[PDB]
Amino acid sequence: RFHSFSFYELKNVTNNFDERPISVGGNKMGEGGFGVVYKGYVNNTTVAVKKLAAMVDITTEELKQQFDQEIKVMAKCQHENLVELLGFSSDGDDLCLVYVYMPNGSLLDRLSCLDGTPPLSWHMRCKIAQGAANGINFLHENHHIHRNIKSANILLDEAFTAKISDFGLARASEKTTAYMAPEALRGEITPKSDIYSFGVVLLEIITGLPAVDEHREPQLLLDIKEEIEDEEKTIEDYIDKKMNDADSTSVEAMYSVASQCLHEKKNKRPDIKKVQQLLQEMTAS
Ligand SMILES: Nc1ncnc2c1ncn2[C@@H]1O[C@H](COP(=O)(O)OP(=O)(O)NP(=O)(O)O)[C@@H](O)[C@H]1O
Numbered sequence: 645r646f647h648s649f650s651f652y653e654l655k656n657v658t659n660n661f662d663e664r665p666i667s668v669g670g671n672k673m674g675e676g677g678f679g680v681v682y683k684g685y686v687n688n689t690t691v692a693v694k695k696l697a698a699m700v701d702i703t704t705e706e707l708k709q710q711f712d713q714e715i716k717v718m719a720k721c722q723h724e725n726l727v728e729l730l731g732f733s734s735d736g737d738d739l740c741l742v743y744v745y746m747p748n749g750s751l752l753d754r755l756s757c758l759d760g761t762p763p764l765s766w767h768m769r770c771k772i773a774q775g776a777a778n779g780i781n782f783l784h785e786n787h788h789i790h791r792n793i794k795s796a797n798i799l800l801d802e803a804f805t806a807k808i809s810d811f812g813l814a815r816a817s818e819k820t821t822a823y824m825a826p827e828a829l830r831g832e833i834t835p836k837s838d839i840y841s842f843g844v845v846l847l848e849i850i851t852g853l854p855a856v857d858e859h860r861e862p863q864l865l866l867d868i869k870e871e872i873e874d875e876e877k878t879i880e881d882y883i884d885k886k887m888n889d890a891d892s893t894s895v896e897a898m899y900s901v902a903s904q905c906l907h908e909k910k911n912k913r914p915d916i917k918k919v920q921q922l923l924q925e926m927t928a929s
């Protein structure tokens with residue numbers, strides 16, 4: 645079902661790539677590593693369109709095949725916890741990617757309760773963290789590295805199933821430091837870097853706090869692990885007060901996983917399968 649789109653159909657579907665925000669009449673959902681992301685409706689499906697690069701800038705045939713083979717891998721990585729890539733476009737001015745629109749947005753927006761949405765229950769946050777780990781495991785099982793794990797790249801479908809997004813885009817970008825591992829900051833590429841970033845997301849899930857805040861002590865959310873180990877604060881102090889069903893036992897279970905993930909030595913962190921085990925045992929009975 646993965647196919648190509650005419651750049652001029654995507655133009656119509658996005659109201660001529662209306663860069664205005666949706667709230668004022670446009671189609672802009674946001675912007676990240678590859679500029680504006682546009683919302684549209686095509687083939688009886690609400691979609692998210694992402695403009696990678698310009699077709700003129702893809703000059704050499706090596707750059708053409710560097711993106712063709714890169715998109716082949718993305719289109720093949722289909723899983724319950726991965727955003728489905730519907731297609732692409734190359735016949736026009738810009739190289740585009742068409743993803744399935746996730747109606748509940750990103751985990752980042754729901755943790756901050758953007759647009760008046762209700763806060764996620766602790767029961768849902770556990771199922772979301774488990775699904776995200778299942779999606780990361782699918783990538784690692786097939787020898788892939790996401791390289792850009794963060795709450796903004798964990799989307800939620802109609803049933804609040806976790807859908808990892810933007811896989812391979814960081815790979816194509818090299819062809820947001822608050823989530824990156826120490827070895828990732830130094831340029832090292834390893835699936836153990838994803839485990840570290842997933843640990844930061846778990847802290848966001850527990851606290852409902854963003855990974856970085858300029859007017860906050862500490863500024864980086866990953867630094868609160870030092871406050872817990874030094875007995876300056878407890879995990880109970882940081883628990884999202886907007887939850888109504890949190891229990892200290894399972895919360896400390898998820899924090900124990902987040903702690904192991906945030907080991908500075910990449911060999912001390914568990915693999916994604918151990919993360920799956922601990923997250924599944926967290927809700928066992
Ligand atoms: N398929 C999608 N469905 C719904 N929302 C999406 C989808 N893809 C991206 N978004 C959201 O749209 C916004 C723009 O996406 P994006 O350009 O990826 O920014 P970003 O994720 O914050 N930074 P980055 O992913 O590293 O480029 C973010 O709030 C995303 O969570």
Ligand SMILES: [Mg+2]
Binds near residue numbers: 676796797809810
């Ligand atoms: Mg993203």
